[PDB]
From a paper:
Here, we present structural and functional characterization of the [name] ORF6 that allows us to establish its function as a [name] (SSB) and extend this annotation to other DUF2815 family members. In this study, we show that the [name] ORF6 is structurally homologous to the gene 2.5 protein from bacteriophage T7, and present a high-resolution structure of ORF6 in complex with ssDNA, which reveals for the first time the structural basis for the ssDNA-binding mechanism of T7-type SSBs.
The structure of the full-length [name] ORF6 protein was solved to 1.50 Å resolution using a selenomethionine-substituted protein. Apart from the C-terminus, the [name] ORF6 protein adopts a compact, roughly globular shape with a diameter of approximately 40 Å and has a mixed α/β architecture comprised predominantly of β-strands. The protein can be regarded as built up from a concave seven-stranded β-sheet at one side of the protein, of which the three central strands together with the two β-strands from the opposite side form a slightly flattened five-stranded β-barrel at the protein core, and two α-helices cap the β-barrel at both ends. The ORF6 structure extends from the canonical OB-fold by having two extra strands (β1′ and β1″) at the N-terminus, a helix α1 and strand β23′ in the loop connecting β2 and β3, and two extra strands β34′ and β34″ between β3 and helix α2. The helix α1 is rather long and packs with the three N-terminal strands, completely obstructing the opening of the β-barrel. The C-terminus of the ORF6 protein is notably acidic with 16 of the 29 C-terminal residues being either aspartates or glutamates. These residues, as far as they are visible in the electron density map, do not form any secondary structure and extend away from the rest of the protein in a direction nearly parallel to strands β4 and β5. Interestingly, the very end of the traceable C-terminus inserts into the groove of the seven-stranded β-sheet of a neighboring molecule in the crystal, with possible implications for oligomerization.
Residue numbers in the entry: 2 to 38, 44 to 97, 101 to 188
């Protein structure tokens, strides 16, 4: 089965399957080469509030549908347990940004700027560094288990869009190393 668009907006697409393409967002903390924290592949997407209002509205609507249609009944989920956070409230590079966390245990497809699929972890890590711009396909899902109630986003694919200043390495919290 293929993706079928339901609604297209500036900087994104909602598909009939519930998948969401988020376009032209800045990446942070990429873990596409190897899984990180059951370890999962992940990425953080920084959506500028000025340019991504329409796709953020879709994301909010899909989050609410995901809560409502949860299998055991409509699920009450705290704002801090959603895959989208507010960069101005909840967190410097996040200022004026919506902050999306998407994860998957299955390696997402990773495409370079020429839309070639990258297979090698070293090339994946070199191409998609924190600070570059990407587009991504995600899909919301609801979690209700012993670890809590969340609305999460599966990470299906990432496309590199453009280079920009790297955020650097030095952004890992080292404060728990001796515990
Ligand atoms: Cl980063
Ligand atoms: Mg938009």
């Amino acid at each position: 089965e293929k993706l079928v668009p339901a609604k297209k907006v500036k900087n994104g697409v909602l598909y009939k399957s519930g998948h969401i393409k988020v376009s032209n967002v800045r990446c942070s903390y990429p873990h596409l080469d190897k899984p990180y924290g059951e370890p999962k592949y992940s990425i953080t997407l920084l959506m500028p509030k000025d340019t991504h209002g329409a796709i953020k509205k879709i994301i909010d609507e899909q989050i609410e549908l995901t809560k409502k249609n949860h299998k055991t009944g409509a699920l009450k989920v705290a704002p801090s347990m959603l895959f989208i956070k507010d960069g101005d409230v909840d967190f410097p590079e996040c200022e004026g940004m919506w902050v999306i966390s998407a994860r998957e245990s299955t390696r997402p497809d990773v495409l370079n700027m020429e839309r070639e699929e990258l297979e090698s972890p070293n090339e994946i890590a070199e191409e998609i560094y924190g600070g570059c711009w990407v587009s991504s396909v995600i899909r919301p899902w609801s979690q209700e288990n012993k670890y809590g109630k969340r609305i999460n986003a599966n990470l299906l694919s990432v496309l590199k869009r453009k280079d920009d200043e790297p955020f650097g390495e030095g952004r890992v919290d080292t404060s728990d190393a001796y515990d």
